[PDB]
């Protein structure tokens, strides 16, 4: 029933459309969903998929460490 | 039991290291796996993940078809 990434109890749906953080977060909310939390995916196999996509805190999720206000990225919605 | 993409009984495991097609194909074979067939993913929701990665035919999987650097790849069919 999960057309995406299944991990524990959360299903992650990829939105391949590039959008700003504000538009991505609003788009997930329009589907009763939120952007991924970085601490719940950082140490898992999910990082290879969620890399460079929007995190819930307004920053891209990055494995190894600009203007995040108008940059545009892909994103997952979960929950 | 699938730490990747599950679609219709097949599990796709992402390999994030960039490899040539020959080494990507050998890496899947060493685990009794194959690269995705384009005909099995093209019209599905998998296409957004497997796009630009190696297909079994030696070409990258593209949404619309019609330059041999290293790419990421999925393995399936363990």
């Amino acid at each position: 029933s999960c057309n995406g990434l299944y991990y524990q109890g959360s299903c992650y749906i990829l939105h391949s459309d590039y959008k700003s953080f504000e538009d991505a977060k609003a788009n997930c909310a329009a589907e009763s969903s939120t952007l991924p939390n970085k601490s719940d995916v950082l140490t898992t196999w999910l990082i290879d998929y969620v890399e460079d996509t929007w995190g819930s805190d307004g920053n891209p999720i990055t494995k190894t460490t600009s203007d995040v206000s108008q940059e545009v990225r892909k994103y997952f919605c979960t929950g | 039991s699938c730490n990747g993409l599950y679609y219709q009984g097949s599990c796709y495991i992402l390999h994030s290291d960039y490899k040539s097609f020959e080494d990507a194909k050998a890496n899947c074979a060493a685990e009794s796996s194959t690269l995705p067939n384009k005909s099995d993913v093209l019209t599905t929701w998998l296409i957004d993940y497997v796009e630009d990665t190696w297909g079994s035919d030696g070409n990258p999987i593209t949404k619309t078809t019609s330059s041999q650097e290293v790419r990421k790849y999925f393995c399936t069919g363990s």
């Epitope: 590039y18 959008k19 700003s20 538009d23 890399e51 460079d52 996509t53 891209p60 990055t62 600009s66 203007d67 995040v68 108008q70 940059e71 545009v72 990225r73 892909k74 | 960039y18 630009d52 650097e69 790419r71």
Partner: antibody, heavy 122, light 100 residues
Amino acid sequence: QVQLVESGGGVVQPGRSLRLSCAASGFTFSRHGMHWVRQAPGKGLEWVTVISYDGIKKYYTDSVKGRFTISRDNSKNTLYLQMNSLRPDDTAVYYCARQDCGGDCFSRFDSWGQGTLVTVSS
Amino acid sequence: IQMTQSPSTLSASVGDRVTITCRASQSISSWLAWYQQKPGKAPKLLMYKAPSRFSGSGSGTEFTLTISSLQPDDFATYYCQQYNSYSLTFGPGTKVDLKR
């Protein structure tokens, strides 16, 4: 100090080819998408093409599709624009530019090269 | 899919509040930045952190640049930039010159 130095411009006859280069220094080249932008004499800026940080994705404006090819060499920190079937309307100053966002993204250009002149004329 | 900047030219004195508007025909996903270019030189990205006199405001079809206090260093041409559907586009440009 982020530096982008371009070369390869010059005068070339219509129908022939030219190759532009852009040497990058002062930043992690492999983590940033790169762009080419051109400006015809007396005209505005026109976006030409982008290549992703890892060289996988390339996109072009319509007027150069099939004629121009963007490429990059991350071990040499150099960006390339191979231009074929050059037309007189390709006459412009060409700039390379760096996206400031890291990885798979699109964003504003915070570093620009000094530009190199391309003149297409018989 | 037409992009216009109004006005194409404008005159202002040192110390004025200048507004440059850049519109689009439809929803263009996201406005990216404003750029300042002087003759003979490469364009320069405008940053809203320095007190910075530059401020951008984008609401769908409209993108606006505000220069709160103009100095003689700000007389140049300004270009908006936006991303839409795997491409980027600069606006036609607005030249700001010294009023007399």
